[PDB]
């Protein structure tokens with residue numbers, strides 16, 4: 765795959781070189797090009813440089829992470845979850861699950877909130893390139909959080925880095941605590957669901973910044 769800003773048929777110097785120089789490209793070879801916004805298949809026309817290609821068929825850029833990415837975040841005060849669902853949507857979350865935690869101020873979510881979150885979601889995906897829209901389900905209790913093939917819980921009291929446990933091939937389950945945070949009993953209770961504690965640095969982070977940090981380290985970090 766090559767990088768061509770705009771898919772105009774003119775591969776920038778760097779791209780032209782590597783393909784012909786290193787990869788050893790010739791006239792006829794069918795490769796793909798993308799500019800980050802769209803993509804398509806091509807057929808090396810002239811080696812230039814710059815190498816001029818022939819777009820054969822417009823492709824649909826891979827936008828999804830690859831595995832299911834569930835975000836279990838505690839109900840936040842105000843419209844915080846609105847900023848979370850947005851960033852999370854553009855970060856790869858394929859499903860967002862609000863959680864009712866001991867210290868989570870709000871204990872429930874009205875159809876109005878669940879409405880705006882879904883609105884924000886279906887918009888964030890649209891504005892991120894994603895065609896898939898993350899599912900924003902009605903809140904539930906921690907106890908409901910099922911067993912997970914893989915789970916990471918942003919825990920201030922942890923020593924494990926995400927890049928030391930993250931298994932790219934297996935689905936992903938994330939968990940962030942409310943403004944107050946997860947209760948010592950809640951945390952371990954999640955670990956009993958398959959959630960491995962993870963640190964997001966040596967500074968206190970808002971539930972929103974925490975969900976973003978965690979998410980970014982499991983997708984944007986791995987370049988997926």
Ligand SMILES: C[S@@+](CC[C@H](N)C(=O)[O-])C[C@H]1O[C@@H](n2cnc3c(N)ncnc32)[C@H](O)[C@@H]1O
Pocket residue numbers: 917918919920921939940941942943944945946962963964965966967968969970971974
């Ligand atoms: C802002 S914290 C609540 C206050 C925090 N327990 C404290 O006393 O420092 C809410 C959530 O943000 C996430 N978080 C914030 N800072 C974190 C950190 N340094 N490491 C891991 N998670 C963190 C966790 O999900 C935490 O439950």
